[PDB]
């Protein structure tokens, strides 16, 4: 399994080392947001060997670590246009050189606006309902500006109908994403004290109580 | 450097139908060096085939791959609900290896009379900054549909926002949520707020109800 | 510069006969002695005897005299022992090395070296055990998991290169004694790419290999 590291937010004109814990290059793979993934470059920790694509060559370096076994880039010199996810994939060597197993991936964002936290907003479960099957209730995220936050029910335990939207520019660079879960447990409720987000940037969390109102 | 063709796109089909996806190149590639890859909505792309014929080390023979020279077509012999995903083409033939546009298979099942539920604002950002309402339209099938928000019996402009999530692996539904966020003040006379929404489901506008 | 490649562990018995087999890697013996060198386990080296393929010649310590016959084969250029005659008292990692002449007889280059082991008892398999790597551990950084190698009886046995810890082994109630290996991975989840934990005995010649799974 390939671990990667977390959503650098950088300034027009900075540096992000991207880890990917790491006979197996590393490809490292770009994907602008909403777009196609291209190929930036390769390594292989047991020889050393670098090679990068020729548009990217003067401000990538890729290196890796064979001891600690641990591959990084150094994407220096990087303009706005650069802010897209990036991915770590295991090679095959000459003729099968076929992306195997992938990273999580890495989001850098790259535009000097600022970091907001994730202000998380009132949940107030609907009263008069469905009869039982569905109850709806929803612990919303607003007003934070650098994407990710995850945000999971019961720290990760709820995972039957947590269902989480995209966010969505509003007036400001800000973004916004609501997260909303389904409870066959009416009245009370077993676990309700729930609701855990976490911020890359910011590295705040925030865990609120529902209750039925 | 090989731009390349891939398939039309987005697909409607029923489950039990065979699927083609195909992936023209406009520079002559070798008869056997492109892999086609599958990502799932959010996560990282798994590899489907290697080398045009082969297929990756546990993934089920309904994903066949063929072509030659310069057209690469990858054919689903039956599509379950577990394979709405995009698909790329990879020519790791020529250098630098230059990946597909991409093509989208959305699996074509049931139309999904949606549950509509609204969260009138509460007393935490009703304490600071801007408010917001929210009209949650869960489970929905397929992606047409449109929400206006009504507010106190009174139509309302473009100051919405609707963001809707991808179709689920298992459930292949569309769930939405449309937004109106407010001055935090203008919650005076405004007894009721509601999103009518209109659907391929269910025969009338559904439309709600705040009050409190 | 050549390295030198010597045997593997052999286990004799009280009376027995050991041919330890240094190797010239190169091809080359040229005007350059081995000199052999004891070192019984916890303690400080010895000189044993001298050879030079080119001339055949060959000495030896007056203890070690009457037991012990060193010879060398120039044309396929391999060196040995044979200590014929041996007590328990022998058990010891026995080294090779390259003279250098008259008054320059310092040790340059040795050889990896080769731990005879001379009692009657036995000989018994490396048993490898239960790895189980802790669920609950660091958040991260180290996820320790190690495949661990318990009765076994005449040592060498290899085992599991940034965090394979390895400890001596150490005697139990029988002759037998065991040593544990432990690794540290980054990939905490599935931690999976350790499923070769390799292990070799010489004496045995029984190669182990198994695959951690977090529980």
């Known amino acids: 399994q390939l671990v990667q590291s977390g959503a650098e937010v950088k300034k027009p004109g900075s540096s992000v080392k991207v880890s990917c814990k790491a006979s197996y290059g590393i490809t490292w793979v770009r994907q602008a947001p909403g777009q196609g993934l291209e190929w930036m470059g390769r390594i292989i920790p047991i020889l050393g060997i670098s090679r990068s694509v020729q548009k990217f060559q003067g401000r990538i370096t890729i290196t890796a670590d064979k001891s600690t076994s641990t591959a990084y880039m150094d994407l220096s010199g990087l303009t706005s246009d650069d802010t897209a996810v990036y991915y770590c994939?295991?090679?095959?060597?000459?003729?099968?050189?076929?992306?195997?197993?992938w990273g999580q991936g890495t989001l850098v964002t790259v535009s000097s606006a600022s970091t907001k936290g994730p202000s998380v907003f009132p949940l107030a479960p609907s009263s008069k309902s469905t009869s039982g099957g569905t109850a709806a209730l929803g612990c919303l995220v607003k007003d934070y500006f650098p994407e990710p936050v995850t945000v999971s029910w019961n720290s990760g335990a709820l995972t039957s109908g947590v269902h989480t939207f995209p966010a969505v520019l509003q007036s400001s660079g800000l973004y916004s994403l609501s997260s909303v879960v389904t409870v066959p447990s009416s009245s009370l409720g077993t676990q309700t004290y729930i609701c855990n987000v976490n911020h890359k940037p910011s590295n705040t969390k925030v865990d609120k109580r529902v209750e039925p109102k | 450097e090989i731009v390349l063709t891939q398939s039309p796109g987005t697909l409607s089909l029923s489950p039990g139908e065979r699927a083609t996806l195909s992936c023209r190149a406009s520079?002559?590639?070798?008869?056997?060096?492109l892999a086609w890859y599958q990502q799932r909505p959010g996560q990282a792309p798994r590899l489907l085939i290697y080398?045009?014929?082969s297929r990756a080390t546990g993934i089920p023979d309904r994903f066949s791959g063929s072509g030659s020279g310069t057209d690469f077509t990858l054919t689903i012999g039956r599509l379950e609900p577990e394979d709405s995903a995009v698909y790329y083409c990879?020519?790791?033939?020529?250098?630098?290896?230059?990946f597909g546009q991409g093509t989208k298979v959305e699996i074509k099942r049931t139309v999904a009379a949606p549950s509509v539920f609204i969260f009138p604002p509460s007393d935490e950002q009703l304490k600071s900054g801007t408010a917001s309402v929210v009209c949650l339209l869960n489970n929905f099938y397929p992606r047409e549909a449109k929400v206006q928000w009504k507010v106190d019996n009174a139509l309302q402009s473009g100051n919405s926002q609707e963001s809707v999530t991808e179709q689920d692996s298992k459930d292949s539904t569309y769930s939405l949520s449309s937004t109106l966020t407010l001055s935090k003040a203008d919650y005076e006379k405004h007894k009721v707020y509601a999103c009518e929404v209109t659907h391929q489901g269910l025969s009338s506008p559904v439309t709600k109800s705040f009050n409190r | 510069q050549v390295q030198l490649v010597q045997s593997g562990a052999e286990v004799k018995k009280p009376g027995s006969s050991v041919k330890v087999s240094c190797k010239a890697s190169g091809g080359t013996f040229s005007s350059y002695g081995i000199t052999w060198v004891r070192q019984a386990p916890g303690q400080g080296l010895e000189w044993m005897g001298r050879i030079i393929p080119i001339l055949g010649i060959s000495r030896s310590v007056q203890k070690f005299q009457g037991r012990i016959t060193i010879t060398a084969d120039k044309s396929t250029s391999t060196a040995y022992m044979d200590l014929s005659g041996l007590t328990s008292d022998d058990t010891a990692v026995?080294?090779?090395?390259?003279?250098?002449?008259?008054?320059?007889?310092?040790?340059?280059?040795?050889?990896?070296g080769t731990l005879v082991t001379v009692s009657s008892a036995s000989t018994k398999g490396p048993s490898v055990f239960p790895l189980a790597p802790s669920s609950k551990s660091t958040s991260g950084g180290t996820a320790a998991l190690g495949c661990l190698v318990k009765d076994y009886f005449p040592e060498p046995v290899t085992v599991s290169t940034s965090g394979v810890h390895t400890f001596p082994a150490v005697l139990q109630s029988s002759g037998l004694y065991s040593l544990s290996s432990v690794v540290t991975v980054p990939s905490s989840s599935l931690g999976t790419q350790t499923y070769i934990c390799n292990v070799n005995h010489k004496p045995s010649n029984t190669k182990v290999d198994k695959r951690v799974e977090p529980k």
């Open positions: 994939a295991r090679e095959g060597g000459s003729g099968y050189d076929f992306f195997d197993y």
């Open positions: 990879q020519q790791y033939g020529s250098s630098p290896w230059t």
């Open positions: 080398g045009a014929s």
């Open positions: 520079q002559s590639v070798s008869s056997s060096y």
